[PDB]
Design an enzyme around this catalytic site. Sequence first.
Site: not given
Lengths: 267, 267, 267, 267
Positions: A102, A126, A187, A245
């Site tokens: 990510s 990803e 985040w 993920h």
Amino acid sequence: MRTRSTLTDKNGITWYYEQEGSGPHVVLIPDGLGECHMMDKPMSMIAGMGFTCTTFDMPGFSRSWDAPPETYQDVTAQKLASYVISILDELHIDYATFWGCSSGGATVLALAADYPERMRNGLPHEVPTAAGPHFGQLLKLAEMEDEAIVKMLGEEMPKLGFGHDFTAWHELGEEAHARMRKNYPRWARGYPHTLPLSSPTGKEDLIKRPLDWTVGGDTPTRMFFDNIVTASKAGIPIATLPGMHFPYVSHPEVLVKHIVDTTRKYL
Amino acid sequence: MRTRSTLTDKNGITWYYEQEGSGPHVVLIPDGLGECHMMDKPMSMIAGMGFTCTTFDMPGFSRSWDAPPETYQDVTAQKLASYVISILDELHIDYATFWGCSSGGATVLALAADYPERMRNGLPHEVPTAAGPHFGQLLKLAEMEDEAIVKMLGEEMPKLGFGHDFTAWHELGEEAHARMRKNYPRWARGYPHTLPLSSPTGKEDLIKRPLDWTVGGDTPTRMFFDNIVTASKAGIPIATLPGMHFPYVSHPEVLVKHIVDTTRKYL
Amino acid sequence: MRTRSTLTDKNGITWYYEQEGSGPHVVLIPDGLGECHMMDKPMSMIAGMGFTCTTFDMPGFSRSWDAPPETYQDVTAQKLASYVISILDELHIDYATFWGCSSGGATVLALAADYPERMRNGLPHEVPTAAGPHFGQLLKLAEMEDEAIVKMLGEEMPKLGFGHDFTAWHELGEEAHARMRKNYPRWARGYPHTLPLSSPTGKEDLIKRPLDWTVGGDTPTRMFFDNIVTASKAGIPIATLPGMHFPYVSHPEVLVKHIVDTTRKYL
Amino acid sequence: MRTRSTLTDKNGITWYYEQEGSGPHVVLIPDGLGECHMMDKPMSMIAGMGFTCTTFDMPGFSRSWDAPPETYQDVTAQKLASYVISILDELHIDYATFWGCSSGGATVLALAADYPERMRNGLPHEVPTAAGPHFGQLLKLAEMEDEAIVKMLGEEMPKLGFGHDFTAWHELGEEAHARMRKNYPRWARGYPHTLPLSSPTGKEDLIKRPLDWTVGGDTPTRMFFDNIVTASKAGIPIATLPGMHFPYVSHPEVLVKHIVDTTRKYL
């Protein structure tokens, strides 16, 4: 075996870091949640193959919480790469294999593009490249909510949406989940808006150093379709690995097999 | 509206077919199950956009079940392309847009490679190209089982593995499911072992005619990852559409929008 | 081992029935769907224990669907009991153990209440006694919809609503589901409005003959809570057996064990 | 507002407790996990109806974890009742309505049996009475495992098994889940071996004070079937309320409605 410590970078970040093993250096950059305990199970398996593995909590997250706001607000792949270089320099690491998923994967790309002398080989997983394409709907609106409900929408989603092994994701432990709680709103405020258009995905940048681009086996194709198309058009080895993920969480053994196998080809 | 009939071609196949609308020809080739009622909901929506839509049950399946055994044993993309050409000739369609998923998609590619003069533009979806690239459980072994257990293993798997819309998968109606049950073992004996190796995926064949290659948005990445890599390396437009393996079942409106939009670029 | 036939009783019902084995008589009355193929797997297991098992499609349903409208409209437990007595008389059964679920269970209760001379012992399972027993969907409303959408609301819900053994639910086979599809609107028009009020649950009626009342182990507690309260207050042996609403489908072996074990106490 | 403090009782327990509102006393005893934050949402709703609500973490759990080992080892319903009496006396509550689920429910029964003068009316929910009236692994073995894996099987099971509103269960917050982590092994070692057998379910005990026994609407029938049978045979009001094992978490509003309505019928 595993060693832990804390240290400061000229940036003002008070990093928490962990290391284990000996040999060539492997650096595991966390995802946006910035919680390196997600690597707890894989690391021993990696280190046992003759590598020194290093990880750390990301600036402003978990045990790296003491950090200036600029390091976790308006976050870009370039800034994250600079922070990783700083902590990595301070740890007396010269040259290393880098894993990242990510935003961490974005960091990996930024490391390949802008610090190629420091990378043996890169493994991104990803990478978010579009406004909204990380889980399902726009995270880029979550910043408008209050912190408790931000954390609650986030900790209510991660299990089925991407971290799809409830026993492993929950095996992270309770202290880690308590830290992730406080990580979620930071985040949402700093990682969703700004990271996607900063992943350097140009052909020449992706080709500077050996690069293995991966996607979760059970992730829906549409989420990171662009990753596959970009990597294959650029000639980058692109493949799928078990999980979604958090392959290091849901499938630690296959994650370490992939890390080790790829690293071994570029020693 | 819908017109239906049965006709024999020189191969000895007694086809069941359906037609609706007026305008340029669009041909919807079914998936391996060979049940064209899966297109029942989409067809009206396609025809309403000014097209003549044609579909049919595949040789040996559903209402086309009265067919010679070679037409549904040791099946290849080339054989299916020849059969489709036969039925298309008898319906006196000269040139048409062809849709196909799975083996039907394999057929579409075979139609691009070997009958390009008959194809206006092609739409393949989730083409099987490997013995392992499939979200099932080694179909190529299912032929060893008894008919009842093959059909029940079948009908228990695609509903969550291949459609992921139970009310839509199930609205096909029970006469259709009644035909599909009997289709399952014939599919297992003739479509898993022979079909994957026969899809012509070389650049040269893929470029002969306009081609839009699609993958299910909700399919997990590993199932048809190879499709994405191949299409992107060859320069073929590749994208995702809502659904998985049966987009015309699970998401008929977006399926017809995609068909119509792509077909309209190539009249 | 299994014999199948058709015969007409004085009501005008053209019954389809099945028999297997030898010994004391056990009669398996279907649930509201009236499809006796749901007993296909259990019957042999029961017959092997030294019993002749008899089942049949219910009036107006599946292969017994050629029946006068009065037999499948405004259906009551009393009417069903009289019909079962008729078909049992024609099959020259004098005395038998009766199993029944849902309306069939209601039938069993009525058989205990009004034909005690004909039952050795009775087994009812999840008898509906209230309007719209199911939590989510109001069965008492399904009659307002058109047949196709009724069947689709039905065939789409029973699997997770009533069996939760999907592989077992459809191994019933293609013909059984083909009949059940057409059974649905007839059930909706004739079985939800009138059956719940007709179950004889008075203490004296429940005590006329040996009675073992069961509920699905995996059924939500509230669905047939009233069954438990009523049976336990009356002193009726009440227990659960594996499965939900179709234990003979989802769990054939434990179903046959229960049937045999209970029947064995009362020869 | 809600008032918070800590206090010491004669047993040597450092209790954490919460109080809110004014009026007749209602006491909410935790389930085995002993985490009173599960009542966070219901309590205000109860207090608004004209009641003073009191709750607390159970000895050895969450914020009451500073307690002698005897208070959370070899736990019986009688011991828990004595501890609850201690904490109510220290808060100078004379007489109150008591709610309890699981072990807390057992405690409620023990309070009805042995301290009836202190109970206005009792509300128990899903009382464990056997070593095996659940589905899966014997809880009585979990103590043999290491603490981390004990916590890992618990936090991985109850969200879908017992407390099934994942957004609410997870709405408890991470500080609460961090406490529940350390609660799991202590519960496994002290609560499942010894508690099920100590719940007083004799008729004479159940009738001493007004008692409304409840079971989760979505709980599988088999889990607390014995509760229904026992309550109905003894003549105790037995009913279902929305949710499963943690109705106050999954369905706070209906939990509060139930508490208030029943308490108001006996003021």
